[PDB]
Short mmCIF file of C-alpha atoms and ligand atoms in Angstrom, two decimals:
data_model
loop_
_atom_site.label_atom_id
_atom_site.label_comp_id
_atom_site.label_asym_id
_atom_site.label_seq_id
_atom_site.Cartn_x
_atom_site.Cartn_y
_atom_site.Cartn_z
CA UNK A 12 10.14 -23.89 13.22
CA UNK A 13 7.45 -21.39 13.79
CA UNK A 14 8.94 -18.09 14.36
CA UNK A 15 7.85 -15.40 16.93
CA UNK A 16 8.24 -11.71 16.76
CA UNK A 17 7.21 -9.12 19.49
CA UNK A 18 6.74 -5.70 18.84
CA UNK A 19 6.75 -2.88 21.16
CA UNK A 20 4.46 0.22 21.13
CA UNK A 21 5.33 3.34 18.98
CA UNK A 22 6.70 6.10 20.99
CA UNK A 23 4.08 8.63 20.33
CA UNK A 24 1.63 5.91 21.49
CA UNK A 25 3.01 5.66 25.11
CA UNK A 26 3.69 9.57 25.38
CA UNK A 27 0.12 10.45 24.89
CA UNK A 28 -3.02 9.34 26.87
CA UNK A 29 -5.12 9.96 23.64
CA UNK A 30 -3.26 7.16 22.01
CA UNK A 31 -3.58 3.50 22.57
CA UNK A 32 -0.20 1.85 22.73
CA UNK A 33 -0.01 -1.77 21.93
CA UNK A 34 2.23 -4.63 22.23
CA UNK A 35 2.00 -7.20 19.36
CA UNK A 36 3.08 -10.57 19.07
CA UNK A 37 3.45 -12.22 15.65
CA UNK A 38 3.94 -15.51 14.58
CA UNK A 39 5.03 -16.82 11.10
CA UNK A 40 5.76 -20.05 9.64
CA UNK A 41 2.67 -21.85 11.16
CA UNK A 42 2.48 -25.05 9.31
CA UNK A 43 -0.75 -26.21 7.35
CA UNK A 44 -0.57 -29.69 9.10
CA UNK A 45 -0.38 -28.37 12.61
CA UNK A 46 -2.29 -24.97 12.26
CA UNK A 47 -3.22 -24.71 15.89
CA UNK A 48 -1.64 -21.80 17.90
CA UNK A 49 -2.33 -20.69 21.29
CA UNK A 50 -1.04 -17.34 22.97
CA UNK A 51 -0.46 -16.83 26.56
CA UNK A 52 0.49 -13.20 28.00
CA UNK A 53 2.39 -11.98 30.89
CA UNK A 54 2.77 -8.78 32.61
CA UNK A 55 6.05 -8.89 35.02
CA UNK A 56 5.23 -12.77 34.94
CA UNK A 57 1.58 -12.76 35.91
CA UNK A 58 -0.83 -13.97 33.22
CA UNK A 59 -3.19 -11.31 31.80
CA UNK A 60 -6.16 -12.16 29.47
CA UNK A 61 -7.36 -9.14 27.81
CA UNK A 62 -5.15 -9.67 24.41
CA UNK A 63 -6.98 -9.70 21.19
CA UNK A 64 -5.93 -12.38 18.77
CA UNK A 65 -6.93 -11.98 15.00
CA UNK A 66 -8.11 -15.00 12.93
CA UNK A 67 -5.00 -16.48 11.20
CA UNK A 68 -4.33 -15.47 8.11
CA UNK A 69 -2.90 -17.72 5.29
CA UNK A 70 0.11 -16.10 3.28
CA UNK A 71 1.21 -16.93 -0.30
CA UNK A 72 3.89 -19.20 0.82
CA UNK A 73 1.21 -21.84 2.18
CA UNK A 74 2.25 -20.78 5.67
CA UNK A 75 0.09 -19.25 8.40
CA UNK A 76 0.52 -15.96 10.02
CA UNK A 77 -1.07 -15.33 13.55
CA UNK A 78 -1.21 -11.88 15.39
CA UNK A 79 -1.98 -11.21 18.91
CA UNK A 80 -2.49 -7.90 20.17
CA UNK A 81 -2.16 -6.38 23.76
CA UNK A 82 -2.97 -3.09 24.74
CA UNK A 83 -0.96 -1.71 27.45
CA UNK A 84 -1.36 1.02 29.84
CA UNK A 85 0.71 4.08 29.23
CA UNK A 86 2.02 4.41 32.72
CA UNK A 87 2.87 0.61 32.64
CA UNK A 88 4.93 0.67 29.81
CA UNK A 89 6.72 3.80 31.23
CA UNK A 90 6.96 2.21 34.59
CA UNK A 91 9.07 -0.45 33.04
CA UNK A 92 6.63 -3.44 32.96
CA UNK A 93 7.81 -6.81 31.00
CA UNK A 94 5.58 -8.15 28.41
CA UNK A 95 5.97 -11.67 27.75
CA UNK A 96 4.22 -13.46 24.56
CA UNK A 97 4.13 -17.25 24.95
CA UNK A 98 3.40 -19.22 21.62
CA UNK A 99 2.34 -22.84 21.78
CA UNK A 100 2.19 -24.85 18.62
CA UNK A 101 2.22 -28.57 18.59
CA UNK A 102 4.60 -28.52 15.92
CA UNK A 103 7.00 -26.80 18.47
CA UNK A 104 8.76 -28.93 20.92
CA UNK A 105 8.80 -26.26 23.59
CA UNK A 106 6.58 -23.11 23.68
CA UNK A 107 8.59 -19.88 22.30
CA UNK A 108 8.69 -16.96 24.61
CA UNK A 109 9.57 -13.15 23.96
CA UNK A 110 9.75 -10.54 26.45
CA UNK A 111 9.72 -6.75 25.48
CA UNK A 112 10.03 -3.86 27.70
CA UNK A 113 10.92 -0.23 27.60
CA UNK A 114 14.86 -0.04 28.06
CA UNK A 115 16.22 0.09 31.43
CA UNK A 116 18.33 2.96 32.73
CA UNK A 117 17.44 6.33 34.01
CA UNK A 118 15.59 8.77 31.77
CA UNK A 119 17.27 11.92 30.64
CA UNK A 120 15.87 15.14 29.32
CA UNK A 121 16.38 15.77 25.87
CA UNK A 122 18.18 19.11 24.85
CA UNK A 123 16.65 20.46 21.78
CA UNK A 124 18.44 22.84 19.52
CA UNK A 125 17.75 24.45 16.22
CA UNK A 126 20.10 25.21 13.48
CA UNK A 127 19.90 27.60 10.90
CA UNK A 128 21.31 26.72 7.14
CA UNK A 129 25.05 27.05 6.80
CA UNK A 130 25.93 30.39 4.79
CA UNK A 131 27.29 28.25 1.69
CA UNK A 132 23.97 26.58 1.49
CA UNK A 133 22.02 29.58 0.59
CA UNK A 134 23.19 29.60 -2.74
CA UNK A 135 20.77 26.62 -3.56
CA UNK A 136 16.95 26.68 -4.25
CA UNK A 137 16.34 24.73 -1.11
CA UNK A 138 17.82 25.17 2.40
CA UNK A 139 18.23 22.50 5.38
CA UNK A 140 16.87 23.43 8.67
CA UNK A 141 18.26 21.41 11.67
CA UNK A 142 16.94 20.17 14.82
CA UNK A 143 19.53 18.65 16.96
CA UNK A 144 18.35 16.52 20.07
CA UNK A 145 21.03 15.33 22.26
CA UNK A 146 21.25 13.61 25.85
CA UNK A 147 18.03 11.75 25.86
CA UNK A 148 17.55 8.43 27.32
CA UNK A 149 15.91 6.14 26.50
CA UNK A 150 15.93 6.16 22.72
CA UNK A 151 12.32 5.93 22.17
CA UNK A 152 11.31 9.38 20.73
CA UNK A 153 9.33 11.27 18.00
CA UNK A 154 10.37 14.49 16.16
CA UNK A 155 8.12 16.47 13.98
CA UNK A 156 8.34 19.71 12.00
CA UNK A 157 5.51 22.68 11.47
CA UNK A 158 5.06 25.83 10.63
CA UNK A 159 2.18 28.19 11.35
CA UNK A 160 0.49 25.55 13.08
CA UNK A 161 1.07 23.32 9.67
CA UNK A 162 2.92 20.10 9.63
CA UNK A 163 5.74 20.03 7.19
CA UNK A 164 6.24 17.10 4.62
CA UNK A 165 9.75 17.39 3.55
CA UNK A 166 11.84 16.37 6.69
CA UNK A 167 13.83 13.49 7.47
CA UNK A 168 15.42 12.23 10.80
CA UNK A 169 18.35 10.25 11.65
CA UNK A 170 18.15 7.23 13.78
CA UNK A 171 19.19 7.69 17.44
CA UNK A 172 22.74 7.22 17.98
CA UNK A 173 24.63 6.33 21.24
CA UNK A 174 26.57 9.17 22.56
CA UNK A 175 29.95 8.79 24.56
CA UNK A 176 28.05 9.34 27.74
CA UNK A 177 25.64 6.72 27.56
CA UNK A 178 23.00 8.99 26.40
CA UNK A 179 21.38 9.29 22.81
CA UNK A 180 21.14 11.82 20.25
CA UNK A 181 19.83 12.56 16.70
CA UNK A 182 19.30 15.15 14.07
CA UNK A 183 16.38 16.00 12.06
CA UNK A 184 16.72 17.71 8.73
CA UNK A 185 13.80 19.98 7.52
CA UNK A 186 14.25 20.97 3.72
CA UNK A 187 12.24 24.03 2.44
CA UNK A 188 12.49 26.27 -0.48
CA UNK A 189 15.08 28.95 0.19
CA UNK A 190 12.55 31.80 -0.44
CA UNK A 191 10.34 30.65 2.58
CA UNK A 192 13.26 30.80 4.86
CA UNK A 193 14.24 34.22 3.46
CA UNK A 194 10.64 35.40 3.92
CA UNK A 195 11.23 35.15 7.66
CA UNK A 196 8.65 32.49 8.13
CA UNK A 197 8.94 30.72 11.45
CA UNK A 198 9.49 26.97 11.76
CA UNK A 199 9.27 24.62 14.69
CA UNK A 200 10.81 21.48 15.71
CA UNK A 201 8.79 19.66 18.17
CA UNK A 202 10.02 16.68 20.14
CA UNK A 203 8.13 14.16 22.23
CA UNK A 204 10.05 11.99 24.90
CA UNK A 205 9.15 10.56 28.17
CA UNK A 206 11.57 12.80 30.20
CA UNK A 207 9.93 16.00 28.79
CA UNK A 208 7.45 17.64 30.86
CA UNK A 209 3.92 16.97 29.20
CA UNK A 210 6.03 14.78 27.13
CA UNK A 211 6.61 17.51 24.52
CA UNK A 212 8.81 20.68 23.98
CA UNK A 213 9.01 22.82 20.78
CA UNK A 214 11.70 25.01 19.63
CA UNK A 215 11.42 27.69 16.73
CA UNK A 216 13.74 28.76 13.78
CA UNK A 217 13.54 31.71 11.92
CA UNK A 218 15.81 33.93 9.77
CA UNK A 219 17.50 36.85 11.76
CA UNK B 12 23.20 -25.81 9.47
CA UNK B 13 25.48 -23.01 9.14
CA UNK B 14 24.25 -19.58 7.63
CA UNK B 15 26.85 -17.26 5.51
CA UNK B 16 27.08 -13.68 5.74
CA UNK B 17 29.10 -11.33 3.12
CA UNK B 18 30.61 -8.13 3.85
CA UNK B 19 31.58 -5.02 1.78
CA UNK B 20 35.08 -3.16 2.09
CA UNK B 21 35.10 -0.11 4.67
CA UNK B 22 34.39 3.06 2.59
CA UNK B 23 37.80 4.56 3.63
CA UNK B 24 39.83 1.74 2.18
CA UNK B 25 38.33 1.92 -1.21
CA UNK B 26 38.76 5.50 -1.27
CA UNK B 27 42.50 5.91 -0.38
CA UNK B 28 45.12 4.36 -2.55
CA UNK B 29 47.11 3.34 0.34
CA UNK B 30 44.86 1.30 2.21
CA UNK B 31 43.71 -2.23 1.70
CA UNK B 32 39.97 -2.62 0.73
CA UNK B 33 38.87 -6.21 1.80
CA UNK B 34 35.68 -8.29 1.14
CA UNK B 35 34.74 -10.76 3.98
CA UNK B 36 32.96 -13.79 3.70
CA UNK B 37 31.83 -14.77 7.42
CA UNK B 38 30.43 -18.21 8.31
CA UNK B 39 28.81 -18.86 11.57
CA UNK B 40 27.03 -21.67 13.48
CA UNK B 41 29.67 -24.31 12.33
CA UNK B 42 29.36 -27.07 14.60
CA UNK B 43 32.17 -29.18 16.04
CA UNK B 44 30.97 -32.18 14.19
CA UNK B 45 32.17 -31.17 10.78
CA UNK B 46 34.27 -27.72 11.05
CA UNK B 47 35.64 -28.03 7.73
CA UNK B 48 34.60 -25.50 4.85
CA UNK B 49 35.81 -24.55 1.58
CA UNK B 50 36.07 -21.00 0.13
CA UNK B 51 35.74 -20.50 -3.82
CA UNK B 52 35.93 -16.78 -4.62
CA UNK B 53 34.60 -15.34 -7.90
CA UNK B 54 34.93 -11.88 -9.40
CA UNK B 55 32.41 -11.10 -12.10
CA UNK B 56 32.16 -14.89 -12.07
CA UNK B 57 35.88 -15.39 -12.85
CA UNK B 58 37.83 -17.24 -10.13
CA UNK B 59 40.69 -15.32 -8.54
CA UNK B 60 42.85 -16.91 -5.86
CA UNK B 61 44.38 -14.43 -3.55
CA UNK B 62 42.06 -14.95 -0.65
CA UNK B 63 42.95 -16.45 2.61
CA UNK B 64 41.36 -18.01 5.58
CA UNK B 65 41.54 -16.96 9.22
CA UNK B 66 42.02 -18.83 12.58
CA UNK B 67 39.09 -20.38 13.47
CA UNK B 68 37.48 -19.22 16.80
CA UNK B 69 35.20 -21.10 18.93
CA UNK B 70 32.12 -19.14 20.17
CA UNK B 71 30.16 -19.13 23.39
CA UNK B 72 27.33 -21.45 22.30
CA UNK B 73 29.11 -24.52 20.99
CA UNK B 74 29.79 -22.62 17.62
CA UNK B 75 32.61 -21.62 15.63
CA UNK B 76 33.44 -18.84 13.06
CA UNK B 77 35.25 -19.26 9.68
CA UNK B 78 36.14 -16.06 7.80
CA UNK B 79 37.81 -15.98 4.28
CA UNK B 80 39.08 -12.44 3.20
CA UNK B 81 39.87 -11.35 -0.36
CA UNK B 82 41.50 -8.27 -1.29
CA UNK B 83 40.21 -6.09 -3.93
CA UNK B 84 41.53 -3.59 -6.44
CA UNK B 85 40.29 -0.06 -5.51
CA UNK B 86 38.94 0.31 -8.97
CA UNK B 87 37.40 -3.17 -9.11
CA UNK B 88 35.09 -2.51 -6.29
CA UNK B 89 34.41 1.16 -7.32
CA UNK B 90 33.80 0.10 -10.99
CA UNK B 91 30.95 -2.31 -9.94
CA UNK B 92 32.53 -5.55 -10.05
CA UNK B 93 30.46 -8.41 -8.33
CA UNK B 94 32.29 -10.75 -5.88
CA UNK B 95 30.73 -14.32 -5.05
CA UNK B 96 31.85 -16.07 -1.79
CA UNK B 97 30.86 -19.86 -2.13
CA UNK B 98 30.96 -21.86 1.06
CA UNK B 99 31.19 -25.59 0.67
CA UNK B 100 30.44 -27.81 3.83
CA UNK B 101 29.17 -31.10 4.60
CA UNK B 102 26.16 -30.05 6.95
CA UNK B 103 25.30 -27.85 4.05
CA UNK B 104 23.56 -30.24 1.47
CA UNK B 105 24.89 -27.91 -1.31
CA UNK B 106 27.18 -24.99 -1.46
CA UNK B 107 25.98 -21.46 -0.40
CA UNK B 108 26.56 -18.66 -3.02
CA UNK B 109 26.42 -15.11 -1.73
CA UNK B 110 27.35 -12.00 -3.93
CA UNK B 111 27.88 -8.46 -3.20
CA UNK B 112 28.83 -5.49 -5.12
CA UNK B 113 29.02 -1.52 -4.85
CA UNK B 114 25.32 0.30 -5.02
CA UNK B 115 24.59 0.97 -8.48
CA UNK B 116 24.13 4.44 -9.86
CA UNK B 117 25.60 7.63 -10.66
CA UNK B 118 27.59 8.61 -7.72
CA UNK B 119 26.79 12.18 -6.34
CA UNK B 120 28.85 14.82 -4.76
CA UNK B 121 28.32 15.40 -1.04
CA UNK B 122 27.73 18.98 -0.03
CA UNK B 123 29.45 19.52 3.14
CA UNK B 124 28.32 22.06 5.51
CA UNK B 125 29.50 23.17 9.15
CA UNK B 126 27.14 24.49 11.68
CA UNK B 127 28.03 26.57 14.77
CA UNK B 128 26.82 25.53 18.04
CA UNK B 129 23.13 27.12 18.82
CA UNK B 130 23.13 30.08 21.02
CA UNK B 131 21.05 28.43 23.51
CA UNK B 132 23.60 25.52 23.95
CA UNK B 133 26.11 28.04 24.75
CA UNK B 134 25.18 28.25 28.41
CA UNK B 135 26.55 24.63 28.59
CA UNK B 136 29.94 23.19 29.73
CA UNK B 137 30.40 21.44 26.35
CA UNK B 138 29.01 22.56 22.93
CA UNK B 139 28.41 20.92 19.64
CA UNK B 140 29.89 21.45 16.20
CA UNK B 141 27.92 20.12 13.67
CA UNK B 142 28.70 19.11 10.26
CA UNK B 143 26.00 18.26 7.82
CA UNK B 144 26.78 16.21 4.78
CA UNK B 145 23.96 15.68 2.03
CA UNK B 146 23.39 14.80 -1.43
CA UNK B 147 25.84 12.01 -1.84
CA UNK B 148 25.48 8.73 -3.58
CA UNK B 149 26.24 6.01 -2.90
CA UNK B 150 25.78 5.83 0.90
CA UNK B 151 29.57 4.57 1.67
CA UNK B 152 31.35 7.44 3.32
CA UNK B 153 33.78 8.38 5.92
CA UNK B 154 33.78 11.40 8.18
CA UNK B 155 36.40 12.79 10.41
CA UNK B 156 37.02 15.80 12.84
CA UNK B 157 40.62 17.59 13.03
CA UNK B 158 42.13 20.54 15.20
CA UNK B 159 45.53 21.93 14.13
CA UNK B 160 46.13 18.91 12.06
CA UNK B 161 45.34 16.52 15.08
CA UNK B 162 42.47 13.97 15.10
CA UNK B 163 39.70 14.82 17.66
CA UNK B 164 38.29 12.04 19.53
CA UNK B 165 34.85 13.31 20.86
CA UNK B 166 32.69 13.04 17.91
CA UNK B 167 29.70 10.67 16.69
CA UNK B 168 28.39 10.30 13.23
CA UNK B 169 24.93 9.42 12.32
CA UNK B 170 24.42 6.54 9.81
CA UNK B 171 23.52 7.51 6.35
CA UNK B 172 19.89 8.40 5.99
CA UNK B 173 17.83 8.30 2.55
CA UNK B 174 16.63 11.61 1.53
CA UNK B 175 13.70 12.54 -0.61
CA UNK B 176 15.78 12.98 -3.84
CA UNK B 177 17.33 9.44 -3.44
CA UNK B 178 20.44 10.83 -2.36
CA UNK B 179 21.73 10.18 1.19
CA UNK B 180 22.61 12.59 4.24
CA UNK B 181 24.19 12.43 7.51
CA UNK B 182 25.18 14.46 10.49
CA UNK B 183 28.47 14.51 12.32
CA UNK B 184 28.61 15.87 15.59
CA UNK B 185 31.94 16.96 17.56
CA UNK B 186 31.85 17.67 21.30
CA UNK B 187 34.39 20.22 22.59
CA UNK B 188 34.88 22.31 25.92
CA UNK B 189 33.13 25.73 25.53
CA UNK B 190 36.49 27.02 26.34
CA UNK B 191 38.20 25.97 23.04
CA UNK B 192 35.06 27.22 21.06
CA UNK B 193 35.34 30.61 22.56
CA UNK B 194 39.06 30.78 22.17
CA UNK B 195 38.63 30.70 18.36
CA UNK B 196 40.27 27.54 17.26
CA UNK B 197 39.34 26.16 14.12
CA UNK B 198 37.95 22.75 13.72
CA UNK B 199 37.60 20.86 10.51
CA UNK B 200 35.11 18.14 9.34
CA UNK B 201 36.71 15.72 6.93
CA UNK B 202 34.60 13.93 4.50
CA UNK B 203 35.80 11.13 1.96
CA UNK B 204 33.72 10.02 -0.81
CA UNK B 205 34.17 8.80 -4.28
CA UNK B 206 32.41 11.48 -5.97
CA UNK B 207 34.64 14.07 -4.46
CA UNK B 208 37.69 15.25 -6.17
CA UNK B 209 40.57 13.30 -4.78
CA UNK B 210 38.04 11.63 -2.81
CA UNK B 211 38.13 14.02 -0.07
CA UNK B 212 37.03 17.38 1.25
CA UNK B 213 37.38 19.48 4.21
CA UNK B 214 35.44 22.13 6.00
CA UNK B 215 36.23 24.60 8.56
CA UNK B 216 34.25 25.68 11.70
CA UNK B 217 35.25 28.73 13.68
CA UNK B 218 33.86 31.08 16.25
CA UNK B 219 34.36 34.09 14.22
C1 LIG C 301 5.89 -17.03 4.42
O1 LIG C 301 5.31 -15.87 4.30
C2 LIG C 301 5.37 -15.06 5.44
C3 LIG C 301 4.53 -13.55 5.27
O2 LIG C 301 5.63 -12.68 4.45
C4 LIG C 301 6.77 -14.74 6.13
O3 LIG C 301 6.60 -14.10 7.16
C5 LIG C 301 7.68 -13.27 7.37
O4 LIG C 301 8.70 -13.81 8.11
C6 LIG C 301 9.90 -13.22 8.36
C7 LIG C 301 10.98 -14.09 9.00
O5 LIG C 301 11.42 -15.24 7.88
C8 LIG C 301 9.64 -11.95 9.33
O6 LIG C 301 10.77 -11.02 9.29
C9 LIG C 301 10.87 -10.44 10.85
O7 LIG C 301 10.56 -9.11 10.22
C10 LIG C 301 10.68 -8.22 11.56
C11 LIG C 301 10.11 -7.08 11.40
O8 LIG C 301 8.88 -7.30 10.95
C12 LIG C 301 8.09 -5.99 10.66
O9 LIG C 301 8.50 -5.03 9.64
C13 LIG C 301 8.37 -5.67 8.39
C14 LIG C 301 8.93 -4.71 7.48
O10 LIG C 301 10.25 -4.90 7.33
C15 LIG C 301 6.89 -6.02 8.26
O11 LIG C 301 6.78 -6.68 6.97
C16 LIG C 301 6.36 -7.00 9.38
O12 LIG C 301 5.07 -7.37 9.03
C17 LIG C 301 6.49 -6.29 10.80
O13 LIG C 301 5.68 -5.14 10.82
C18 LIG C 301 5.59 -4.68 12.10
O14 LIG C 301 4.32 -5.36 12.69
C19 LIG C 301 4.29 -4.83 13.95
C20 LIG C 301 3.07 -5.77 14.55
O15 LIG C 301 2.02 -6.05 13.40
C21 LIG C 301 3.78 -3.19 13.94
O16 LIG C 301 3.66 -2.71 15.25
C22 LIG C 301 2.41 -2.26 15.64
O17 LIG C 301 2.11 -1.24 14.73
C23 LIG C 301 0.89 -0.69 14.89
C24 LIG C 301 0.76 0.30 13.87
O18 LIG C 301 -0.53 0.02 13.18
C25 LIG C 301 0.98 0.06 16.28
O19 LIG C 301 2.07 1.14 16.15
C26 LIG C 301 1.37 -0.84 17.36
O20 LIG C 301 1.62 -0.19 18.60
C27 LIG C 301 2.67 -1.69 16.94
O21 LIG C 301 2.73 -2.61 18.09
C28 LIG C 301 5.17 -2.58 13.43
O22 LIG C 301 4.67 -1.16 13.33
C29 LIG C 301 5.54 -3.05 12.02
N1 LIG C 301 6.75 -2.56 11.53
C30 LIG C 301 6.67 -2.11 10.51
C31 LIG C 301 8.32 -1.60 9.89
O23 LIG C 301 6.01 -1.99 9.51
C32 LIG C 301 12.21 -8.24 11.91
O24 LIG C 301 12.48 -7.51 12.93
C33 LIG C 301 12.86 -9.44 11.99
O25 LIG C 301 14.00 -9.38 12.21
C34 LIG C 301 14.76 -10.01 13.55
O26 LIG C 301 14.93 -11.57 13.44
C35 LIG C 301 15.95 -11.82 12.44
C36 LIG C 301 16.10 -13.20 12.39
O27 LIG C 301 15.23 -13.89 11.35
C37 LIG C 301 17.32 -11.20 12.92
O28 LIG C 301 18.16 -11.37 11.56
C38 LIG C 301 17.29 -9.57 13.07
O29 LIG C 301 18.32 -8.92 13.27
C39 LIG C 301 15.89 -9.27 13.67
O30 LIG C 301 16.35 -9.61 15.16
C40 LIG C 301 16.11 -8.72 16.40
O31 LIG C 301 17.19 -7.66 16.19
C41 LIG C 301 16.77 -6.74 17.30
C42 LIG C 301 17.94 -5.81 17.37
O32 LIG C 301 17.81 -4.78 16.45
C43 LIG C 301 16.50 -7.31 18.69
O33 LIG C 301 15.90 -6.46 19.39
C44 LIG C 301 15.25 -8.47 18.52
O34 LIG C 301 15.18 -9.02 19.90
C45 LIG C 301 15.69 -9.48 17.59
N2 LIG C 301 14.74 -10.48 17.55
C46 LIG C 301 15.04 -11.62 17.19
C47 LIG C 301 13.77 -12.81 17.03
O35 LIG C 301 16.10 -12.27 17.12
C48 LIG C 301 12.39 -10.52 10.95
O36 LIG C 301 12.94 -10.08 9.84
C49 LIG C 301 8.47 -11.12 8.80
O37 LIG C 301 8.10 -9.97 9.50
C50 LIG C 301 7.29 -12.10 8.34
N3 LIG C 301 6.13 -11.19 7.63
C51 LIG C 301 5.22 -10.94 8.15
C52 LIG C 301 4.05 -9.86 7.50
O38 LIG C 301 5.06 -11.02 9.60
C53 LIG C 301 7.08 -16.17 6.15
O39 LIG C 301 8.71 -16.13 6.81
C54 LIG C 301 7.35 -17.01 5.02
N4 LIG C 301 7.79 -18.33 5.25
C55 LIG C 301 8.59 -19.24 4.39
C56 LIG C 301 8.99 -20.23 4.63
O40 LIG C 301 8.57 -18.39 3.12
C1 LIG C 302 25.74 -14.17 23.26
C2 LIG C 302 25.78 -14.08 21.55
O1 LIG C 302 27.01 -13.30 21.34
C3 LIG C 302 27.20 -13.25 19.86
C4 LIG C 302 25.88 -12.62 19.13
O2 LIG C 302 26.26 -12.55 17.77
C5 LIG C 302 24.67 -13.16 19.63
O3 LIG C 302 23.68 -12.36 19.05
C6 LIG C 302 24.39 -13.35 21.13
O4 LIG C 302 24.45 -12.16 21.68
#
């Protein structure tokens, strides 16, 4: 059996016009004996023809991998259009179809709160700065940390978790040396989501 | 044919001497034709016999589900012993063997910090009590919230996330009416982990 995988565009990608959001159809386990593969793309059930399909690449397991990439308009993804990738291979009894879209439901504005390091933590050589984001739908989101216009490296963000109200929440942890916090440097948690205005918000953290 | 899945005990069960830690061999996509499977259970290769098979359950797509559950000694699991679940079926040309074990490595103690709700969030009907657990290894953990010795229902815990140092972290969020927070009631975050003394620690959060 040939296998088909459909990947949605990155959240940052749909959110910013500068970026180019893409939907990607991936076909794996295409046999040597029947390597011909054809991709049909549908948007809201209507065929589209602007996809770019890369030349098939042979994997080390003697099976072929074929990828087709469709550029999507930012407003189209945000407006809930459905993307269908249809794959035909002779060695396939019926053509395989996958559909992807932004999750259904009404978008909700993310509330972004910054949390200072617990008192007990200040003992360590490193502190945890917390960016709490809650109440957002859908779950597609991006979170970033910076200081002095400068992007921090040492941060980690939890995956979105379904809250009790049907909305989503997450936490982002930024780890900085204790001295920096103590020095009064200001730290910024930045969030990108569709339900934000300009698709962006920022909140700042600093020792008081 | 049918594909197996093997599952580890819940973290709380292994930690608390009272509870029963279990390992679950789950078999799916068994068809009506030959719905008979056999389970050999092995610990560190050695055959033990105290496992038992559940009532078969028919599924929605003409498929079944035959689960066998072994019980495990708390120290056997925590000490790294390996459990093999071999599923012998007719539609399966040969048996499938799958193994599971605790994650290997020096267990690390979780640091438990409670964070008060943000000042900005305070102009809200309900507020967020944040418990941060970091530096723990391995990932298996249990988190709970309490007030006045009574469980608090309204909380969600993020899945463990791998941090830079190879330890894991998580956040647990408890939601309470702003009124309670103001009244000064104490709320406690409960963490259970192997590296903790008595497999348990408690941290308290109060308005102050
Ligand atoms: C022969 O050798 C072949 C070469 O290795 C081998 O091919 C592999 O086959 C695997 C199957 O056997 C296949 O596994 C699947 O992997 C899925 C995820 O793949 C991504 O992440 C991997 C890392 O873990 C990468 O290695 C993959 O390449 C792939 O990477 C993603 O690629 C996309 C597009 O290229 C990219 O998006 C684009 O990125 C750019 C950035 O430049 C832009 O941002 C664009 O805007 C953006 O579109 C992603 O960024 C990139 N991601 C990453 C992390 O890099 C995985 O999802 C599959 O799991 C599903 O199916 C299994 C069933 O098999 C289920 O058990 C599982 O639960 C998943 O099911 C899904 O569940 C979802 C719910 O959570 C649900 O929503 C879905 O609907 C549901 N889907 C289905 C179908 O049920 C699966 O594991 C692997 O990717 C193949 N390797 C490659 C390189 O393609 C072949 O198998 C070998 N054959 C033999 C016989 O040996
Ligand atoms: C309808 C089926 O229900 C069961 C699940 O394990 C399957 O993924 C599918 O959703």
